[PDB]
Amino acid sequence: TGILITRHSQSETVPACSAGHTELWTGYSLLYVDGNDYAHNQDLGSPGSCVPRFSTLPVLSCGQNNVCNYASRNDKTFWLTTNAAIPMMPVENIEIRQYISRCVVCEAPANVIAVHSQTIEVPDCPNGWEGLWIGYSFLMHTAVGNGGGGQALQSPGSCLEDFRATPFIECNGAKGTCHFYETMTSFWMYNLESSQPFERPQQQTIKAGERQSHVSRCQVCMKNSRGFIFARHSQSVHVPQCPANTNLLWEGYSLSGNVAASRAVGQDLGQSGSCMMRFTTMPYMLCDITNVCHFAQNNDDSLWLSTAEPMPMTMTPIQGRDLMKYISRCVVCETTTRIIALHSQSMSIPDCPGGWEEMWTGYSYFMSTLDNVGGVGQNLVSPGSCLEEFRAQPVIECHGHGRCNYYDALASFWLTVIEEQDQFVQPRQQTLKADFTSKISRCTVCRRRYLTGILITRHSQSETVPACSAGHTELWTGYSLLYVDGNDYAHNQDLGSPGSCVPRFSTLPVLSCGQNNVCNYASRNDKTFWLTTNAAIPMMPVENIEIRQYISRCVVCEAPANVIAVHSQTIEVPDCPNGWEGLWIGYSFLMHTAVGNGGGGQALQSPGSCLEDFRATPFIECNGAKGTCHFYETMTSFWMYNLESSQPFERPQQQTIKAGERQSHVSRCQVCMK
Amino acid sequence: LTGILITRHSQSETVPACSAGHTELWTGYSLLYVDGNDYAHNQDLGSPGSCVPRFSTLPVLSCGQNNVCNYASRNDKTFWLTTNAAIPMMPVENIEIRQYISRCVVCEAPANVIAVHSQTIEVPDCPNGWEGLWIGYSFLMHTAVGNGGGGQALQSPGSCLEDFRATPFIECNGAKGTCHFYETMTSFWMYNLESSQPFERPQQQTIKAGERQSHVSRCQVCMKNSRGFIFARHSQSVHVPQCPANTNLLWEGYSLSGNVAASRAVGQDLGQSGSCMMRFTTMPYMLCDITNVCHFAQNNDDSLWLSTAEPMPMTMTPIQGRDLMKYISRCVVCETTTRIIALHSQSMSIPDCPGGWEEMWTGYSYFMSTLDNVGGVGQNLVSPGSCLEEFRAQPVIECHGHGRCNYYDALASFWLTVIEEQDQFVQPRQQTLKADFTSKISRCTVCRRRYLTGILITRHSQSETVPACSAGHTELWTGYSLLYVDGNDYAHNQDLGSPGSCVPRFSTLPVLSCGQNNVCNYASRNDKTFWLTTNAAIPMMPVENIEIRQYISRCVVCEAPANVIAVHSQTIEVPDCPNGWEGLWIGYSFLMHTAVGNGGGGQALQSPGSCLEDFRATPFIECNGAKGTCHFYETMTSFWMYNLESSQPFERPQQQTIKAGERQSHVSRCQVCMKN
Ligand SMILES: [Cl-]
Ligand SMILES: [Cl-]
Ligand SMILES: [Cl-]
Ligand SMILES: [Cl-]
Ligand SMILES: [Mg+2]
Ligand SMILES: [Mg+2]
């Protein structure tokens, strides 16, 4: 059954699958798209980072007035690059090919993960796992400023076989050229060998041939049970225990994320990338285009889940071995079946679906935000969105300097209780003490008790609740959540994830918590964004029960096998891979931008990247505390472009596409099940 | 005539003309801002820097640390005020651009010129003794996409556009040589508050087509008929402050710190009249979109007000309604015959005014406020707005379209700290203060000149030796060349032509941060500072202690007898000074900079700070605040005005990689000029 692994060559060569592993397609290694000044990344370990047809601009931009614009602004694409020497001038048409990494997508017989030693040692695979390749721990990237992204440390995409200081190239979309720029920065996990635990990082500048001995090593491992894994966090100084019917792989320290070059990139707390075997206030170094790397020389941060230990009365930063009292511990566990989280949005703890068993219960944790670096958020189907201890301040901030503290702008967001009758009523402002756990949505983490436990999410893009495919089991129905804009950070749910299908609607489904153990509901200026229906656009915002005709409905279904989207990048519907069968066809939906810092995007292998109805404005903006929703000219949708008339490295030609011609310029897709 | 300059934009293809006896200095094209390396650097539409003599879709060059500059090689943008021409269906190129670029003129005026805003449908009268030059609509902010954009100073004539347009600017893709209008472009205009009580909830509205004009605040641009320099003064209390001696009251109002629209905070300098609004409201503006619809208080935007010492309610719930009166600081706007400056001691000593200057008030050195994911609002350190009479850990309160205000945890303040002489070039000592804050806050004095009007000039040596004043100029102080502070990941700059960029005492951390619960923190987090650097050689690794001084540019602040501007040739030729002006120095046209993270900033093109005497591809250094070490990084970019000598105006820029050995020959030149 179709567990899918993606391999990147970091060269002009197309990589190969192993024997036994069936090749699904080959392509070009896509890192991220910069659309309307918003960076939307693909996971390098996922099939969505392997794009069959190259273009410097494989996307189309669509606005609120039935006009789409191709290659009409200043959007960029970023691709993993090769070992070719850095050119003096930007490269154009077929010379580009020498600089774009190639990739292959393969079906593996069992789960595949990356493990990281955080040292010069190559880490071993866990018992019952075997190595596929070894490499270097690739953590984050920025092209310029804080525009960039980062990898999940559980993902094979965080383990690149070739260490390169500049591992990606930047393409000017409409100019059709690609180049390297001095601001391009890579961030790699650092070799912590023999470092003094909890003491100040020993700053280093490293050059040329000595760089590699300072990079953390990794191995990508496949299970020989299909070997699904997850993390569990104690939120205390005590190491937690793996739940019944799961086996301990390793213990560690709870990594929430990293803030490099003023961009926070989180590690999902359900994944093994949130459980580091070695704690440090600075887990990574930066590497520049002149083959110099700097460790703890400038001003970057790490974020760790914390304990309930109080700040000292002096409120001075914590340093030295005192830090041990403040950092949460974790374990990584292996299970024969998949793990999910369910959120009630009520005081009721949700029950596990029929056929599943409860691993733990907790509180619905949505995101943490920071000042002027964005934030770090959880997938609402991940166990990381279900923390067993409610905390106003669940995350502590640490610096290259070697100290950590709670700083005032650190905020947390949790799903709130929404009584059924209150869904379409204006949120009522409330300030609460952080021991009032009765205002916080409850959650349950479940493993499947043979079906491995795959969930499919479908969005109707209408007022009608959609049905599961025949033979699939309906688990719940809900409303199509796209993202929450909280303290001016946009945290998305992928539309293929059950986390985008929330059972209860509200213009404000979250509350925020801050310092002094105080939480606030509907007390500031937050907003939420939902996939919308086919209803006519209103002349002014809609309010309370009128909102219901503009919110897409959804259903979450349990399916016997894996599901992916495939994209033709042409006007034709793509066939499913050999051995897979189609569930629905649609239009290739990549990313979106909106007012302020608003934006997000879909994984290209996710069913969320395949919407059945093409809509230039597929989502609506809800004013959180006002209880009203509306469409705005600041909303943009990005779809994969129909490249049928283009050569791979041909420069995009500007096109303004009007009315009924828009759909003919949009890539088609099919959602397929093994 | 001392060389006071007024800038007018026609919002049309026709070049505008100067008033009666006003002498024309030059004409040009109306530059709004430049988006370089994903950083927006704006020109003040009321200043000569917004009037650029030679158009290009990309009039700038990008230079890096590794011996290469790039022209038209990335995805940089320019934004220009536009005309009344109909919006095209697709981007326009080459000569088709011309009909869409507003023209401008720079004129010499005999006296000070300001904008006054009614915040109503009524055109405000000029203050007694002032004469109107034009009337218009109150233009506050703009965004092109996301939170990239900027805003006007409400004292500036640039906040008073004669023609109201929902889309008053056009966007040019630098390297493609095309310009266009995009659906995400938004303008923000001050709102007509005629039918509303000040502390009642904003009554949200959606306004269509023909009714939009009647909801826009009106303004008049006024010239003094004394030259009538003005300043604001804030009480930080509900009491209306008094105008100091030898100054006269123009109006009283409420202390506006800034606005946060589409997730971009744009401050009003607290020394300028734009920080003193006649009418308070939690939502002073509306947004207007490209489809001729405006929305007032329908979505989620903010205003920022200087606050009183009134305690938050113990419940910590937001404040609403009549209760808001207790929290909003009051202000006055005063006129004076001479100019106003602030001096900062960086110590517990209160500084004395220079010889020939008289003290108006004393206070504490206020640098900036930061907010979460919208940036921050900062003060010019020579402005009286950088000298607040009362220290406050939380000097600013945040207000919403909803009609409520509160302090929120992410709202932080930054103050200049005490730096002893012996603390310079030493690693900062961490300190968390729960009491005795004033032991670590710099003191300041606001002075007016006692005839010379008190014009101050700043020179940067780009060396470790202090530069000299031009003869006839009086030296007031010397210092170190501060470019910007990166605090809570907001970059707040000092213009290199402002005396605020000349800091008497160096530290890798010259500020401390204060926040909720009345706690201040020095060297406690991860802040950093950027200084103009020297001619010294690039180090192989970060420098420390006795090595840092050779890398920090020195500066001098001098009093000049007449006004001083930079002029730019936009060619390899050194430009002549205007008729009746004489040159002080020559140099290279320095527009903006970007660095790690959210780091960046830029110079006003009429400021001497836009004219550096030495070209350096990496003209500044990055100091790690708490570590006390400084270094150069590949993330540092400098932007210079480009040599357009052989470019036709609407010609498409040609990509060029420019290697060391010819970088200087592609850089516009400048001369800094003083009125005779
Ligand atoms: Cl584009
Ligand atoms: Cl809110
Ligand atoms: Cl460019
Ligand atoms: Cl610091
Ligand atoms: Mg906001
Ligand atoms: Mg930072």
PDB file of C-alpha atoms in Angstrom, chain B residues 229-333:
ATOM      1  CA  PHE B 229       8.538  76.637  12.487  1.00  0.00           C
ATOM      2  CA  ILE B 230       6.248  74.342  14.452  1.00  0.00           C
ATOM      3  CA  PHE B 231       6.449  71.463  16.891  1.00  0.00           C
ATOM      4  CA  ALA B 232       4.131  69.301  18.969  1.00  0.00           C
ATOM      5  CA  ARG B 233       4.295  68.906  22.744  1.00  0.00           C
ATOM      6  CA  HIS B 234       2.619  66.042  24.626  1.00  0.00           C
ATOM      7  CA  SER B 235       1.483  65.932  28.239  1.00  0.00           C
ATOM      8  CA  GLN B 236       1.240  62.124  28.593  1.00  0.00           C
ATOM      9  CA  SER B 237      -1.825  62.965  30.696  1.00  0.00           C
ATOM     10  CA  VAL B 238      -5.383  64.230  30.306  1.00  0.00           C
ATOM     11  CA  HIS B 239      -4.157  67.781  30.935  1.00  0.00           C
ATOM     12  CA  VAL B 240      -3.533  69.894  27.838  1.00  0.00           C
ATOM     13  CA  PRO B 241       0.148  70.971  27.877  1.00  0.00           C
ATOM     14  CA  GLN B 242       1.259  74.579  27.498  1.00  0.00           C
ATOM     15  CA  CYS B 243       3.322  76.042  24.696  1.00  0.00           C
ATOM     16  CA  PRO B 244       6.815  76.945  26.002  1.00  0.00           C
ATOM     17  CA  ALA B 245       7.898  80.554  26.308  1.00  0.00           C
ATOM     18  CA  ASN B 246       8.557  82.417  23.052  1.00  0.00           C
ATOM     19  CA  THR B 247       6.243  80.022  21.180  1.00  0.00           C
ATOM     20  CA  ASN B 248       2.558  80.460  20.328  1.00  0.00           C
ATOM     21  CA  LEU B 249      -0.375  78.045  20.320  1.00  0.00           C
ATOM     22  CA  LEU B 250      -1.864  76.894  17.009  1.00  0.00           C
ATOM     23  CA  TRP B 251      -4.208  74.136  18.221  1.00  0.00           C
ATOM     24  CA  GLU B 252      -4.725  71.520  20.921  1.00  0.00           C
ATOM     25  CA  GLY B 253      -5.498  67.873  20.331  1.00  0.00           C
ATOM     26  CA  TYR B 254      -4.878  64.194  21.092  1.00  0.00           C
ATOM     27  CA  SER B 255      -1.510  62.420  20.922  1.00  0.00           C
ATOM     28  CA  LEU B 256      -1.417  60.161  17.839  1.00  0.00           C
ATOM     29  CA  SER B 257       1.572  57.766  17.842  1.00  0.00           C
ATOM     30  CA  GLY B 258       0.791  55.992  14.570  1.00  0.00           C
ATOM     31  CA  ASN B 259      -1.526  53.690  12.653  1.00  0.00           C
ATOM     32  CA  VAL B 260      -1.423  49.975  11.836  1.00  0.00           C
ATOM     33  CA  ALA B 261      -3.209  49.263   8.541  1.00  0.00           C
ATOM     34  CA  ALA B 262      -2.980  45.961   6.674  1.00  0.00           C
ATOM     35  CA  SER B 263      -0.463  44.791   9.302  1.00  0.00           C
ATOM     36  CA  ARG B 264       1.993  47.668   8.752  1.00  0.00           C
ATOM     37  CA  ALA B 265       2.665  50.129  11.578  1.00  0.00           C
ATOM     38  CA  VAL B 266       3.487  53.641  10.351  1.00  0.00           C
ATOM     39  CA  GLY B 267       4.408  56.146  13.029  1.00  0.00           C
ATOM     40  CA  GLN B 268       3.783  59.860  13.377  1.00  0.00           C
ATOM     41  CA  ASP B 269       6.911  61.542  14.704  1.00  0.00           C
ATOM     42  CA  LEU B 270       5.924  62.881  18.117  1.00  0.00           C
ATOM     43  CA  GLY B 271       7.694  66.182  17.450  1.00  0.00           C
ATOM     44  CA  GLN B 272       5.558  66.971  14.391  1.00  0.00           C
ATOM     45  CA  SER B 273       2.017  68.286  14.129  1.00  0.00           C
ATOM     46  CA  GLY B 274       0.873  64.959  12.651  1.00  0.00           C
ATOM     47  CA  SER B 275       1.073  63.520  16.179  1.00  0.00           C
ATOM     48  CA  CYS B 276      -1.570  65.999  17.431  1.00  0.00           C
ATOM     49  CA  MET B 277      -5.046  65.243  16.044  1.00  0.00           C
ATOM     50  CA  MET B 278      -7.916  67.587  16.749  1.00  0.00           C
ATOM     51  CA  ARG B 279     -10.371  64.677  17.017  1.00  0.00           C
ATOM     52  CA  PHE B 280      -9.716  61.392  18.787  1.00  0.00           C
ATOM     53  CA  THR B 281     -11.122  58.128  17.492  1.00  0.00           C
ATOM     54  CA  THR B 282     -10.081  54.498  17.661  1.00  0.00           C
ATOM     55  CA  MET B 283     -10.234  54.318  13.832  1.00  0.00           C
ATOM     56  CA  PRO B 284      -9.148  57.587  12.189  1.00  0.00           C
ATOM     57  CA  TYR B 285      -9.033  56.280   8.595  1.00  0.00           C
ATOM     58  CA  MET B 286     -10.773  54.103   6.011  1.00  0.00           C
ATOM     59  CA  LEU B 287      -9.406  51.787   3.316  1.00  0.00           C
ATOM     60  CA  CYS B 288     -10.181  52.288  -0.381  1.00  0.00           C
ATOM     61  CA  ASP B 289      -9.796  49.613  -3.056  1.00  0.00           C
ATOM     62  CA  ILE B 290      -9.226  49.505  -6.799  1.00  0.00           C
ATOM     63  CA  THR B 291     -12.927  48.899  -7.543  1.00  0.00           C
ATOM     64  CA  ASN B 292     -13.961  52.297  -6.088  1.00  0.00           C
ATOM     65  CA  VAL B 293     -15.275  50.825  -2.833  1.00  0.00           C
ATOM     66  CA  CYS B 294     -14.076  52.111   0.550  1.00  0.00           C
ATOM     67  CA  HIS B 295     -14.562  50.294   3.876  1.00  0.00           C
ATOM     68  CA  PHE B 296     -14.561  52.076   7.244  1.00  0.00           C
ATOM     69  CA  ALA B 297     -13.987  49.922  10.345  1.00  0.00           C
ATOM     70  CA  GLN B 298     -15.238  46.783   8.552  1.00  0.00           C
ATOM     71  CA  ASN B 299     -12.030  44.765   8.855  1.00  0.00           C
ATOM     72  CA  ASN B 300      -9.279  44.576  11.472  1.00  0.00           C
ATOM     73  CA  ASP B 301      -6.975  47.620  11.621  1.00  0.00           C
ATOM     74  CA  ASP B 302      -5.570  49.717  14.447  1.00  0.00           C
ATOM     75  CA  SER B 303      -4.466  53.115  15.676  1.00  0.00           C
ATOM     76  CA  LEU B 304      -1.777  53.906  18.255  1.00  0.00           C
ATOM     77  CA  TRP B 305      -2.014  56.706  20.804  1.00  0.00           C
ATOM     78  CA  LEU B 306       0.403  58.064  23.371  1.00  0.00           C
ATOM     79  CA  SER B 307      -1.123  57.222  26.744  1.00  0.00           C
ATOM     80  CA  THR B 308      -1.568  58.611  30.243  1.00  0.00           C
ATOM     81  CA  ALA B 309      -0.479  56.979  33.485  1.00  0.00           C
ATOM     82  CA  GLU B 310      -4.018  55.705  34.125  1.00  0.00           C
ATOM     83  CA  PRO B 311      -3.867  52.090  35.385  1.00  0.00           C
ATOM     84  CA  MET B 312      -5.347  49.239  33.395  1.00  0.00           C
ATOM     85  CA  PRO B 313      -8.437  47.743  35.037  1.00  0.00           C
ATOM     86  CA  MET B 314      -7.433  44.835  37.263  1.00  0.00           C
ATOM     87  CA  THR B 315      -9.567  42.538  35.075  1.00  0.00           C
ATOM     88  CA  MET B 316      -7.206  43.447  32.174  1.00  0.00           C
ATOM     89  CA  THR B 317     -10.204  43.784  29.839  1.00  0.00           C
ATOM     90  CA  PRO B 318     -10.095  46.262  26.935  1.00  0.00           C
ATOM     91  CA  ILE B 319     -11.262  49.809  27.564  1.00  0.00           C
ATOM     92  CA  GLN B 320     -14.256  51.150  25.674  1.00  0.00           C
ATOM     93  CA  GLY B 321     -16.411  54.228  25.344  1.00  0.00           C
ATOM     94  CA  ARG B 322     -16.172  57.267  27.589  1.00  0.00           C
ATOM     95  CA  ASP B 323     -13.612  55.417  29.749  1.00  0.00           C
ATOM     96  CA  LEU B 324     -11.118  55.877  26.890  1.00  0.00           C
ATOM     97  CA  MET B 325     -10.770  59.601  27.677  1.00  0.00           C
ATOM     98  CA  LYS B 326      -8.748  58.727  30.788  1.00  0.00           C
ATOM     99  CA  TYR B 327      -6.106  56.915  28.727  1.00  0.00           C
ATOM    100  CA  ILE B 328      -5.337  59.225  25.769  1.00  0.00           C
ATOM    101  CA  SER B 329      -2.551  61.800  26.084  1.00  0.00           C
ATOM    102  CA  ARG B 330      -3.230  65.422  25.093  1.00  0.00           C
ATOM    103  CA  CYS B 331      -1.024  67.728  23.035  1.00  0.00           C
ATOM    104  CA  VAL B 332      -0.525  71.190  21.577  1.00  0.00           C
ATOM    105  CA  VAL B 333       1.036  72.401  18.343  1.00  0.00           C
TER     106      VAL B 333
END
